[PDB]
Curated annotation (Swiss-Prot), chain C:
Gene Ontology annotations of biological process type: proteasomal ubiquitin-independent protein catabolic process; proteasome-mediated ubiquitin-dependent protein catabolic process
Membership in a protein family: Belongs to the peptidase T1A family.
GO molecular function, one term: mRNA binding
UniProt keyword Ion transport present: no
The entry's keywords: Acetylation, Cytoplasm, Nucleus, Proteasome
Protein name: Probable proteasome subunit alpha type-7
Organism expressing this protein natively: Saccharomyces cerevisiae (strain ATCC 204508 / S288c) (Baker's yeast)
Subunit (UniProt): The 26S proteasome consists of a 20S proteasome core and two 19S regulatory subunits. The 20S proteasome core is composed of 28 subunits that are arranged in four stacked rings, resulting in a barrel-shaped structure. The two end rings are each formed by seven alpha subunits, and the two central rings are each formed by seven beta subunits. The catalytic chamber with the active sites is on the inside of the barrel.
Swiss-Prot record, chain D:
Keyword Transmembrane helix found: no
Misc: Present with 17100 molecules/cell in log phase SD medium.
Organism: Saccharomyces cerevisiae (strain ATCC 204508 / S288c) (Baker's yeast)
InterPro entries to which the protein is assigned, alphabetical: Ntn_hydrolases_N, Proteasome_alpha, Proteasome_alpha-type, Proteasome_alpha_type_5, Proteasome_asu_N, Proteasome_sua/b
Residues where Phosphothreonine is found: T47
Biological process per Gene Ontology, one example term: proteasomal ubiquitin-independent protein catabolic process
Keyword presence, Nucleus: yes
Keyword annotations: Cytoplasm, Nucleus, Phosphoprotein, Proteasome
Lineage of source species: Eukaryota, Fungi, Dikarya, Ascomycota, Saccharomycotina
Pfam families for this protein: Proteasome (PF00227), Proteasome_A_N (PF10584)
Effect of G41D: In DOA5-1; slight decrease in activity
Protein's UniProt name: Proteasome subunit alpha type-5
Curated annotation (Swiss-Prot), chain F:
Lineage: Eukaryota, Fungi, Dikarya, Ascomycota, Saccharomycotina
Coiled-coil intervals: none
Keyword terms: Cytoplasm, Isopeptide bond, Nucleus, Proteasome, Ubl conjugation
Family per similarity comment: Belongs to the peptidase T1A family.
Protein name from the UniProt record: Proteasome subunit alpha type-2
GO BP terms: proteasomal ubiquitin-independent protein catabolic process; proteasome-mediated ubiquitin-dependent protein catabolic process
Function text: The proteasome degrades poly-ubiquitinated proteins in the cytoplasm and in the nucleus. It is essential for the regulated turnover of proteins and for the removal of misfolded proteins. The proteasome is a multicatalytic proteinase complex that is characterized by its ability to cleave peptides with Arg, Phe, Tyr, Leu, and Glu adjacent to the leaving group at neutral or slightly basic pH. It has an ATP-dependent proteolytic activity.
Subcellular locations according to the entry: Cytoplasm; Nucleus
Family matches, as SMART domains: Proteasome_A_N (SM00948)
Other remarks on this protein: Present with 7060 molecules/cell in log phase SD medium.
UniProtKB/Swiss-Prot annotation, chain I:
Other observations noted: Present with 21800 molecules/cell in log phase SD medium.
Single GO cellular component term: proteasome complex
Quaternary state and interactors: The 26S proteasome consists of a 20S proteasome core and two 19S regulatory subunits. The 20S proteasome core is composed of 28 subunits that are arranged in four stacked rings, resulting in a barrel-shaped structure. The two end rings are each formed by seven alpha subunits, and the two central rings are each formed by seven beta subunits. The catalytic chamber with the active sites is on the inside of the barrel.
Keywords associated with the record: Acetylation, Cytoplasm, Nucleus, Phosphoprotein, Proteasome
Superkingdom, taxonomy of origin: Eukaryota
Subcellular location: Cytoplasm; Nucleus
PANTHER family: METALLOPROTEASE TLDD, PROTEASOME SUBUNIT BETA TYPE-1
GO BP annotations, alphabetical order: proteasomal ubiquitin-independent protein catabolic process; proteasome-mediated ubiquitin-dependent protein catabolic process
UniProt name for this protein: Proteasome subunit beta type-4
Phosphoserine PTM sites in chain numbering: S76
Listed InterPro entries: Ntn_hydrolases_N, Proteasome_beta2, Proteasome_bsu_CS, Proteasome_sua/b, Proteasome_suB-type
Source species of the chain: Saccharomyces cerevisiae (strain ATCC 204508 / S288c) (Baker's yeast)
Main location (coarse class): cytoplasm
């Protein structure tokens, strides 16, 4: 079965599945957990950085696209770089040609279309990385989840990566609560950390191991690492 | 149009087409090179699957890249022509822009790079060739000897050999070449060279050509006799015991 | 022998093209969506499974507009659907640019047809993983169409595809018989909301979110618009009521 | 056959993984980062006594503030170094300054996944991934002394210490214990020489092993045999000392 | 995709051999035998026509001996059609050389070029090699009379006497037995006929199954002359040489 | 999209065979028999119009085609392959010869061109060899009358007489018996008709048979007068009637 | 080896399975059609089957208007039939532009045959699983019928039929011409030729037709058109008042 | 014929103090003998504490300032938010200008 | 323009080429060797446009050297000149043609005779007993037509040139700072270091 239909993305299985895409999705699960949640004033990205050795660094998982947009990654870093760089251009083309900030919803559409092209043609491979995009635009705070299959969904909160289901449950529970953490970023960030810890097990989030990003009403997307996040551990 | 990845990785971390390229070199006729204190010698053996040729016009094994550098090889003859032409051209180009002929390391690094490129480019197979490049840098007298292989790797040797039974002749050279006292003479260097070949040539007066390269574009190829005289003086070193 | 199903443009001994047939499986495995042609327009509707409470309601829109008078909804691999609309949008711009008049629905349908059919000619590409329902109002009436992964398409009175295509196709056949005089835009909107609630049983496990859009010469002026607020709620009710 | 950029059922790229296997077979290379600089050492590993060991170049200079060591199919690294140097020089031509070590690394990794037989995203014309890993080390005013490990996967990690090649797993564990935030350049030098000795099949001398470092003051320097030889002696001594 | 049907004509066998070249050679080995013998006053080219009939027009026929230049000619063993492609490019390289230097092209230069073309089909392109082996017979003012050979691999070498095609081992032994450095063109002609005569797979050795050519420098002139023998001429030389 | 089949579909087998060319010859073997006979003052090519239905109009399907006013072709094998070959042949006769020397190419050269096209479909990437064998007959001032045969490999050879397709073996044999170097054109046509009879199962008349000749110039088939050096085409297809008149003296 | 059945290269027997299988595809729609020639018109009859009740019967057709003068009916899957149609229309339009006169039926047929011959020889192109019947009243040849297949083959007919029960239609028509001794329906009005056509379509198939079971196309001097359900009914009635 | 250039007048001035620097310019913008605007800013804050002005043909001046600002944005993106030093900006701008060596930005730029 | 003269005597060819290199108002150099050795027995002098002059010469040089290495043989003077003509002829119909005129003097070791070839930037070649490019011919062609003989010795040749160079220094407006002379014969190419006062 599967073995005869997972050679490349251009092939459909007898049941209508695209295994190469499914396999790509698998790279995400094997990726370090990251969380995303928003109120009506802010959107937060809390990402657990993973280290190779104890002599290594905890690889960056948060990238800024524009002053009002950024995302967290789970999966193949190179693919996140490619996709983030593409987003940086679309966000940039919008400002230059139209003097308009790109709507978060529209950036999701672009990512979906770029990802899709890599699932219908021979020779290419799907992207192997999941992305959580947060932003503040002309319609408020926004959180998006990107899947290599090309599926992009807008949520109040979510998480991707290993054990990500912990955090996701916590959020689907804490919903009514954090959605109202307006005008108070530190409270949203804390909620973000309490969510990402629901997917811990190995260790405990440390200073050089924690990474957080915030954006909103009067807050240009900015990233905090180490010391700057000590007051959240 | 044709860009199939022919050279790729297999589970154990190998690139079989490069590995098989080497098997083609093992099959080529043995080649050797030893550097004296003021010269370098290149020796090649002559096959005999068919004999009734015309030695005048049949392509020789040692090729001049420029007046001060020569290149010998082991493996696919046709493949070696391609590398030689590219090196001869790169030699002129270097002279035309740097206003100075290539060093032997530069010319080697070039051939090597060309070989590496064919190991990770679509639509092409690696060169079934390994080379020994030798000569003297411009205005320098210190001898130079390098070797390249299908993978694109290269390095310099005091003495080296490639081709069939190169396994055997290398051993000879390892317990017959002293870095402390390299063949201080063109003559004793040419002898040490023929000796190592006789280990595998099996009586081959017409099956052993030797080329001697000295500083300042001084390159010359010995005649059957000149070499034949070396073999004779060597067969006596043995019998006289 | 076998293997006839591993390459896309290959004919099996029985004259079929298995990869296309497999793509269809992907279409049947998707959400259900429909199209109801009416006396002066067409109505589109689709099922939106609420995976979780985390999904922002009313946000992840699925129905798509092409030019200003055409509506498109599809079931199957969503990304493939967007890819097809993008093509259709270019296809439309091109036509208007040269001929000035916005593109006729029949002409637009062939554009998508030829393009989709194209992806069943080479083994270097994959067939589309969606069935698309689209249509609009033009110089001579309203038109409803459904395009299959094979590039096949026809004009319909009503159409459905996806998980509950049978429930829908059933409900649609009824309407066709009990309304030879033709449904109305206003009526088709409620009717649609119902066909969707019924066809949801073939997925009754997960909660959903309804989406409707319509293009009526009288209700929208021949332009495609989404049903929102009151008119939407009125339809959800009409459905939630007759579901009991 | 099967795509050169295909995913395994576990969500990994076959060619990249097989590439990593080729790297395991390479000569060991070790990097130690201290507040006094970064040390880079490698195992020459000549295949014959006739091979002139000093023509083994497995530690090269990118720019005055950046140097790097390789392990695996070393031939595959030539173009990577070339690209690296050009990036460094080019950055300087455009901005009249030194390129940040991380930026230089990110540039090198950008070539990494540019392989395939026609991957829809640009024009990645490289039949296979590189079969060599790199240890990039340097210094820059913003983040000081840095050590990076660049793989054929396109990803790169930052380390305080890192070992790649044949004895990497064992050597890494070694580095795990020995390393601390207050090491001195000399302590690092010795430490690198020590671990190389444990994993090297040959008896470490100044001919089958090479050291180097990069310091803000004098940039990247490759230690000449004589200098290292003494460091080896100094090591043998301090070890026999207990 | 396509990869599935790619023979990969240019790869190495585990033993470091080139499959296609090897099989092309195997193909050549079944071709009519061609022989080239170099004397002191000229060169002889002889070839046996494979497959003939009572109705085959031999007068207007040519399948093994072709004129490349006015000083160079070749004997063919293998696919005639493949050979013609190479011959035409060959004739062009010659004219180009002539137009560039205003001197006829040295024999080896032309041979190295064609051999290089062949070698190419061996290392890249994904195409099959040319199923052809050439025996080049030419003259130039730097090496006088020369005799060369090239095969699918792109390798070439020089000879005093040689053969290509069928029963080469048998023919080579016979040549290596009666050949002598001081031979004369007329001696060479006879040797050539004898060899073929003993390696034929046919009954007798008639003229209608032969092609003959000589490149001599007719004393009463001072220039080089190529002569492709006419049926009648081959019939004559056949009688004299005592084969009637 | 984009033809990604840039590799050869015809390759060498361990035995040294080229499968696709072999198979192509096999396809040719199944074809309807066709033949050609060279006389002293002409050449004749003929085949059987194997109507694939009585509702079909056999005239609308000519197996014998004119390439130049002094050259014609006929075949055995896959008709569609033949058709596109004839188009290319007629065009190459112009692009590569008439447009350069202002005169139609001589038979051997045109045949040579055709052979080339077929050889390419034997080695180019992404294609299969042509499934036909052609018999081309023509005349030219310096070479006179000639007859050739071109195979799927691209090989070609001159013949005094020959046959290809279904019953070639038997036909070739019958020709060897009747051929001589003193045959006049009518004699050859006659022998052609006799030979083709042994190959035709059903009806044998000017409506089931297609025959053409390369003989004298036909000033009547020129279409105009005034240019002395233009005397008309040597190629002439016989009429259903012209054939029957001869079948009576069979 | 066994791939000589996936792409268009020869099988050891010198066959092209993909072309053979494409022929199989032509019957997938289970529809039959036939064309006959009048005195100065050409008619094509084809079964029209509309299974789904949810379909708009007016958009289910396999007959096409290639040009003001050329008409084309297809036997095979609709997506491939439309691909062939679009192309034929483009080809016909261009021919007029470049040569100054209307592309003749037989010429467009040849052109399409050649295009099909190519998918037969090139590996990346699959053949189209359809059979195309072209009809018109050529200004030089008169009533004309030319049909092409996935093999790139094409020829002209006095009359012809295509589909699952093609053989019965053919032999039926054959018998009529063996009798009449002429190669066409000797009728002055196309209405009677359309009637002759439908009549025999019934004999050979042993089936009665309603106005919505058939699809009819007529070609006359300078124009090709298709009849309406009502135009067809008027036809069905006429035949009724004879049996 | 079409002339791709124009002159919008105006003047700019830059003076460097010991621990500060100033860049001034008038706000008038003209065409021939007409005033297009009495207040159309010509000196800009481009970030990283750098002020710029490309006086001359306003269309070219705007294109340059816009291209340089976008350059600052990407510098941050590609070099971990590093601050672009005034000297580095200057070198960057040289490349922007010389890029159009054969169809110049008709402006005199100061930073 | 610069002076470029060539004379073919009994057993050799002599090339005399001015040493001045003037740019606008100043004479930048007075020791310019306007020549390149294509092969041990073939020499080429050149004059023309500023950059094109040396770029072209060196380009031709690199090519003849590559031919020598590949074939281990030295092309005849006739072969080299034909190669050079063709290059210029291509150049004349290109975007920016090389504006260079050349004299090619070689000793054909196979014919054992000296040969002089004159070729202008358009690709116009001709073999002559003696030649010049630019305005040089205007003063010298008459002296040569007069005192030239096919059997002159290399010594008589140098005297004839000296006469030519003197006429040039007398009647020409520009100070070409004397010439550099070179001889090509069976033994190769050498430079007459003593012509500043021979």
């Amino acid at each position: 079965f599967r073995n005869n239909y997972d050679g490349d993305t251009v092939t459909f299985s007898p049941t209508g599945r695209l295994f190469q895409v499914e396999y790509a999705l698998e790279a995400i699960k094997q990726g370090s957990v990251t969380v995303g949640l928003r109120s009506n004033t802010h959107a937060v990205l809390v990402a657990l950085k993973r280290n190779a050795d104890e002599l290594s660094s905890y690889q960056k998982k948060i990238i800024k696209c524009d002053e009002h947009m950024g995302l967290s990654l789970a999966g193949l870093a190179p693919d996140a770089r490619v996709l983030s760089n593409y987003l940086r251009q679309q966000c940039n083309y919008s400002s230059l040609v139209f003097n308009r900030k790109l709507a978060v919803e529209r950036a999701g559409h672009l990512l979906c279309d770029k990802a899709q092209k890599n699932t219908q043609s021979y020779g290419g491979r799907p992207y192997g990385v999941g992305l959580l995009i947060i932003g503040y635009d002309k319609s408020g705070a926004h959180l998006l989840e990107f899947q290599p299959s090309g599926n992009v969904t807008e949520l109040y909160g979510t998480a991707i990566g290993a054990r990500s289901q912990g955090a996701k449950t916590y959020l689907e529970r804490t919903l009514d609560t954090f959605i109202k953490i307006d005008g108070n970023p530190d409270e949203l960030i804390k909620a973000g950390v309490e969510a990402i810890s629901q997917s811990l097990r190995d260790e405990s989030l440390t200073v050089d191991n924690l990474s957080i990003a915030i954006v909103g009403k009067d807050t240009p997307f900015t990233i905090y690492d180490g010391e700057a996040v000590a007051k959240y551990i | 149009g044709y860009d199939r990845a022919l050279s790729i990785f297999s589970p154990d971390g190998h690139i079989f087409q490069v590995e098989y390229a080497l098997e083609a070199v093992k099959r080529g006729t043995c080649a050797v090179g030893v550097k004296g204190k003021n010269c370098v010698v290149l020796g090649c053996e002559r096959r005999s699957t068919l004999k009734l040729q015309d030695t005048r016009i049949t392509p020789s094994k040692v090729s001049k890249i420029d007046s001060h550098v020569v290149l010998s090889f082991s493996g696919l003859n046709a493949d070696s022509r391609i590398l030689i032409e590219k090196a001869r051209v790169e030699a002129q180009s270097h002279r035309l822009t740097l206003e100075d002929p290539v060093t032997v390391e530069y010319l080697t690094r070039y051939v090597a790079g060309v070989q590496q490129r064919y190991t990770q480019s679509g639509g092409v197979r690696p060169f079934g060739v390994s080379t020994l490049i030798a000569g003297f840098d411009p205005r320098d007298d210190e001898p130079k000897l390098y070797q390249t292989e299908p993978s694109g790797i290269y390095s310099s040797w005091s003495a080296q050999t490639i081709g069939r039974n190169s396994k055997t002749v290398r051993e000879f050279l390892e317990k017959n070449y002293d870095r402390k006292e390299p063949p201080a003479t063109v003559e004793e260097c040419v002898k040490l060279t023929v000796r190592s070949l006789l280990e595998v040539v099996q009586t081959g007066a017409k099956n052993i050509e030797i080329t001697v390269v000295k500083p300042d574009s001084d390159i010359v190829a010995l005649s059957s006799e000149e070499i034949n005289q070396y073999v004779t003086q060597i067969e006596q070193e043995k019998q006289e015991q | 022998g076998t293997g006839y199903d591993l390459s896309n443009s290959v004919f099996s001994p029985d004259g079929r093209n298995f990869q296309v047939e497999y793509a269809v499986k992907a279409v049947e495995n998707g959400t259900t969506s429909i199209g109801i042609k009416c006396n002066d327009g067409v109505v589109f509707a689709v099922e939106k499974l609420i995976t979780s409470k985390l999904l922002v309601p009313q946000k992840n829109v699925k129905i798509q507009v092409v030019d200003r008078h055409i509506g498109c909804v599809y079931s199957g691999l969503i990304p493939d659907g967007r890819h097809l609309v993008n093509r259709g949008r270019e296809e439309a711009a091109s036509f208007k640019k040269l001929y000035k008049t916005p593109i006729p629905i029949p002409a637009f349908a062939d554009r998508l047809g030829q393009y989709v059919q194209a992806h069943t000619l080479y083994n270097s590409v994959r067939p589309f993983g969606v069935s698309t329902i689209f249509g609009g109002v033009d110089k001579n009436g309203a038109h409803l169409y459904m395009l299959e992964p094979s590039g096949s398409y026809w004009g319909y009175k009503g159409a459905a595809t996806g998980k509950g295509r049978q429930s829908a196709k059933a409900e649609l056949e009824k309407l066709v018989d009990h309304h030879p005089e033709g449904l109305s835009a206003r009526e088709a909107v409620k009717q649609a909301a119902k066909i969707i609630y019924l066809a949801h049983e073939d997925n009754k496990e997960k909660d959903f979110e309804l989406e409707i859009s319509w293009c009526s010469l009288s209700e929208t002026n021949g332009l495609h618009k989404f049903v929102k607020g009151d008119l939407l709620q009125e339809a959800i009710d009409f459905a939630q009521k007759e579901i009991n | 056959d099967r795509g050169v950029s295909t995913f395994s059922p576990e969500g990994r790229l076959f060619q990249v993984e097989y590439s990593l296997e080729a790297i395991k077979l390479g000569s060991t290379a070790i990097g130690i980062a201290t507040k006094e600089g970064v040390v880079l050492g490698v195992e020459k590993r000549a295949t014959s006594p006739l091979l002139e060991s000093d023509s083994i170049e497995k530690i090269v200079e990118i720019d005055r503030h950046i140097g790097c060591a390789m392990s695996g199919l070393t031939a595959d690294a030539r173009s990577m170094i070339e690209h690296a140097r050009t990036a460094a020089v080019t950055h300087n031509l455009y901005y009249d300054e030194d390129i940040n070590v991380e930026s230089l690394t990110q540039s090198v990794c950008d070539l990494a996944l540019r392989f395939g037989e026609g991957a829809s995203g640009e024009e990645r014309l490289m039949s296979r991934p590189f079969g060599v890993a790199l240890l990039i080390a340097g210094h820059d005013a913003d983040d000081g002394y840095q050590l990076f490990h660049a793989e054929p996967s396109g990803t790169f990690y930052r380390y305080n210490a890192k070992a790649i090649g044949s004895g990497s797993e064992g050597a890494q564990a070694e580095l795990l214990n020995e390393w601390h935030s207050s090491l001195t350049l000399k302590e690092a030098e010795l430490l690198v020489l020590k671990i190389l000795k444990q994993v090297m099949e040959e008896k470490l001398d100044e001919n089958n092993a090479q050291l180097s470092c990069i310091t803000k003051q004098d940039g990247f320097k490759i230690y000449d045999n004589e200098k290292t030889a003494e460091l080896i002696k100094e090591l043998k001594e301090k070890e026999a000392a207990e | 995709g396509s990869r599935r049907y790619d023979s990969r004509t240019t790869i190495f066998s585990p033993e470091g051999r080139l499959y296609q070249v090897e099989y092309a050679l195997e193909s050549i080995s079944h071709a009519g035998t061609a022989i080239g013998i170099m004397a002191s006053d000229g060169i002889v080219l002889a070839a046996e026509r494979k497959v003939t009939s009572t109705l085959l027009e031999q007068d207007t026929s040519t399948e093994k001996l072709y004129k490349l230049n006015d000083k160079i000619a070749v004997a063919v063993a293998g696919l005639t059609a493949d050979a013609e492609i190479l011959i035409n490019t060959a004739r062009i390289h010659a004219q180009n050389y002539l137009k560039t230097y205003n001197e006829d092209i040295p024999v080896e230069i032309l041979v190295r070029r064609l051999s290089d073309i062949k070698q190419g089909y061996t290392q890249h392109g994904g195409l099959r090699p040319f199923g052809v082996s050439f025996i080049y017979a030419g003259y130039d003012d730097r090496y006088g009379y020369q005799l060369y050979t090239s095969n699918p691999s792109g390798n070439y070498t020089g000879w005093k006497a040689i053969s290509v095609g069928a029963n080469t081992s048998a023919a080579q032994t016979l040549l290596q037995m009666d050949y002598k450095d001081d031979m004369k063109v007329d001696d060479a002609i006879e040797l050539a006929l004898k060899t073929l005569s003993k390696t034929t797979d046919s009954s007798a050795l008639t003229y209608d199954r032969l092609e003959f050519a000589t490149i001599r420098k007719g004393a009463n002139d001072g220039e080089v002359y190529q002569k492709i023998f006419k049926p009648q001429e081959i019939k004559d030389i056949l009688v004299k040489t005592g084969i009637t | 999209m984009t033809d990604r089949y840039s590799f050869s579909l015809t390759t060498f087998s361990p035995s040294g065979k080229l499968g696709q060319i072999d198979y192509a010859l096999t396809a040719v073997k199944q074809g309807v028999t066709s033949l050609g006979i060279k006389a002293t003052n002409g050449v004749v090519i003929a085949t059987e119009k194997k109507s694939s239905s009585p509702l079909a109009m056999s005239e609308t399907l000519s197996k014998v085609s004119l390439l130049t006013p002094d050259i014609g072709a006929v075949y055995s094998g896959m008709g569609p392959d033949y058709r596109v070959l004839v188009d290319k042949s007629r065009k190459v006769a112009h692009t590569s010869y008439k447009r350069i020397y202002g005169e139609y190419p001589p038979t051997k050269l045109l045949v040579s061109e055709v052979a080339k096209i077929m050889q390419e479909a034997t080695q180019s990437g992404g294609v299969r060899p042509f499934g036909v064998s052609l018999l081309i007959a023509g005349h030219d001032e310096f070479n006179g009358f000639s007859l050739y045969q071109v195979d799927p490999s691209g090989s070609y050879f001159p013949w005094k007489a020959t046959a290809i397709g279904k019953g070639s073996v038997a036909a070739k044999t019958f020709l060897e018996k009747r051929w001589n170097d003193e045959l006049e054109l009518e004699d050859a046509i006659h022998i052609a008709l006799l030979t083709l009879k042994e190959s035709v199962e059903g009806e044998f008349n000017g409506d089931t048979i297609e025959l053409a000749i390369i003989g004298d110039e036909n000033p009547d088939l020129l279409g105009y007068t005034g240019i002395p050096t233009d005397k008309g085409p040597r190629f002439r297809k016989l009429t259903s009637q012209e054939i029957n008149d001869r079948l009576e003296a069979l | 080896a066994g791939y000589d059945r996936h792409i268009t290269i020869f099988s050891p027997e010198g066959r092209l399975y993909q072309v053979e299988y494409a022929f199989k595809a032509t019957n997938q729609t289970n529809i039959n059609s036939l064309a006959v020639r009048g005195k100065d018109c050409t008619v094509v009859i084809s079964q029209k089957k509309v299974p789904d009740k949810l379909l708009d019967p007016t958009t289910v057709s396999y007959i096409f208007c290639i040009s003001r003068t050329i008409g084309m009916v297809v036997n095979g899957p609709i997506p491939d039939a439309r691909n062939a149609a679009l192309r034929a229309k483009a080809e016909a339009a261009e021919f007029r532009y470049k040569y100054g006169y209307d592309m003749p039926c037989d010429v467009l047929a040849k052109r399409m045959a050649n295009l099909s011959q190519i998918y037969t020889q090139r590996a990346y192109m699959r053949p189209l699983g359809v059979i195309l019947t072209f009809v018109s009243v050529d200004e030089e040849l008169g009533p004309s019928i030319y049909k092409t297949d996935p093999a790139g083959y094409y020829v002209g007919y006095k009359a012809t039929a295509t589909g699952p029960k093609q053989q019965e239609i053919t032999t039926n028509l054959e018998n009529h011409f063996k009798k009449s001794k002429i190669d066409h329906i000797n009728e002055e009005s196309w209405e009677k030729v359309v009637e002759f056509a439908i009549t025999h379509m019934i004999d050979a198939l042993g089936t009665e037709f309603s106005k919505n079971d058939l699809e009819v196309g007529v070609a006359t001097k300078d124009k090709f058109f298709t009849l309406s359900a009502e135009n067809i009914e008027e036809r069905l009635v006429a035949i009724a008042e004879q049996d | 014929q079409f002339n791709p250039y124009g002159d919008n007048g105006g003047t700019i001035l830059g003076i460097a103090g010991e621990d500060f620097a100033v860049l001034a310019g008038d706000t008038r913008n003209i065409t021939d003998y007409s005033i297009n605007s009495r207040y159309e800013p010509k000196v800009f804050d481009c970030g990283d504490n750098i002020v710029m002005s490309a006086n001359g043909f306003a269309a070219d001046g705007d294109a340059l300032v816009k291209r340089f600002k976008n350059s600052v944005k990407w510098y941050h993106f590609d070099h971990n938010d590093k601050k672009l030093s005034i000297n580095s900006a200057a070198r960057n701008i040289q490349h922007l200008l010389y890029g159009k060596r054969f169809f110049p930005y008709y402006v005199h730029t100061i930073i | 323009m610069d002076i470029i003269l060539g004379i073919r005597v009994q057993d050799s060819v002599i090339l005399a080429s001015s040493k001045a290199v003037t740019r606008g108002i100043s004479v930048l150099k007075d020791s310019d060797d306007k020549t390149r050795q294509l092969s041990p027995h073939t020499l080429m002098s050149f004059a023309g446009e500023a950059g094109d002059t040396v770029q072209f010469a060196e380009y031709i040089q690199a090519n003849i050297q590559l031919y020598s290495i590949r074939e281990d043989y030295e092309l005849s003077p006739q072969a080299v000149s034909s190669f050079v003509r063709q290059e210029l002829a291509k150049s004349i119909r290109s975007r920016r043609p090389y504006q260079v005129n050349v004299l090619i003097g070689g000793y054909d070791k196979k014919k054992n005779k000296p040969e002089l070839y004159q070729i202008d930037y358009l690709g116009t070649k001709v073999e002559l007993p003696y030649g010049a490019h630019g305005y040089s011919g205007f003063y010298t062609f008459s002296l040569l037509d007069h005192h030239y003989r096919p059997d002159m010795t290399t010594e008589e040749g140098l005297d004839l040139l000296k006469l030519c160079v003197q006429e040039l220094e007398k009647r020409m407006p520009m100070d070409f700072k004397g010439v550099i002379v070179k001889i090509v014969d069976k033994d190769g190419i050498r430079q007459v270091d003593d012509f500043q006062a021979q």
